[PDB]
Amino acid sequence: KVIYKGDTSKKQVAFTFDISWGDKKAIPILDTLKERDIKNATFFLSAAWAERHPDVVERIIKDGHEIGSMGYNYTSYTSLETNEIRRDLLRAQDVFTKLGVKQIKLLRPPSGDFNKATLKIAESLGYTVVHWSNNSNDWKNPGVNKIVSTVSNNLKGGDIVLLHASDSALQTNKALPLLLQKLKSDGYEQISVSQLISNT
Template sequence: MNYFFVLNGKSMKKTALIIIASFFTAWFLYIGNIVHLPVFSTKDGPKAIYKGEKDLALTFNIGWGDEKAEPILDVLKKENVKSATFFLSGSWAERHPDLVARIVKEGYEIGILGYNYEDYTELEEAKIRQDIAKAQVAFKKLNVKDIKLVRAPTGHFDQKTLKIAERLGYTVIHWSIDSKDWTNPGTEQIINNVSRAKKGDIVLLHASDSAKQTEKALPHILKQLNKKGIELVTVSEMIANAKTKTSEIK
């Protein structure tokens, strides 16, 4: 149904200025809330989850390497952390079946980090489907079942990627706090990068060999979170237990 209003010239100008001012105010507030996300906004389309409403999810990406994953698992066990989500590449999982089995045995969640370390925004749809499908096969062979989460290997994704993931039955997970541990900025800087984490955040960490300082930073990060009274959950638990914030992708 359409509504029509009759306004004189002065009222029309005044109304137009109010509408324009309101629009820009809302726009800047919106941008301020998502500026940390490397994605674009659009009215319609699939969405990626990057934040929850309560609790906090620690996520660890593992794409390659033989040395850092086990020490990270040792720290989590020592600190009595019961919930975490590991995004594993299929190629790494194939080469480290014992570590994959340990992750499952110790109650941690597994998500797919593709098969090869490739930027999905630079691949054709068929190649993205092929990469995810290859990872699916790898995890099935390792008897890892019911994987529902996927993360783009390089962290870069677009609407094309999300549509493919949705068709395959996966939810794309991004993050709201980036530890930047893979840049090896120093233990103190990694701790500081995560220090602003609060309830609802999804934290990005790495257990690949490129992240040489995460093992030392992790106990301090866990201590900070404990002081804040923040409960750790898996990403799936976060999705199930609270409303989630999503970012629509262009």
């Protein structure tokens, strides 16, 4: 009931960007996506961050991208009671609505940590939990070439690719045109995570 990937027999993939902190890297990444004509990437946002940087959220919404939740506080759901998790998710949705975000259907739990409890809660709140199938490791800043080869050497149809647009991502923007070119030249289509889910 978590989604790791979409239809493996079709040439559609989802680039996803997590943002848990920062005020410098997301906007240039957004400028790059616009310049390369991508209007349907997916961004998972910590709502504590979003509340502090509504200008960045505004830009994500304006350019057309899908937004998913990463809760409010950036602490692991596996280390929390049931009610604490529900409350974090509710606080987050409250913030997202005030920022004008279309109602959240998608959840990426902080740090990617979840268990059985988390999933049922998420289901109780109407959320689909989203993981990934292709980790760029861009948060490690291993070099542009390494980000590009990690994603592209392993690229399969249906992939959900993990990238970051937080201020930890020093090289993601530099890698992004090369990633998008690889997609186009090899006949893959970049779609949002919701588009990918419905296309399964």
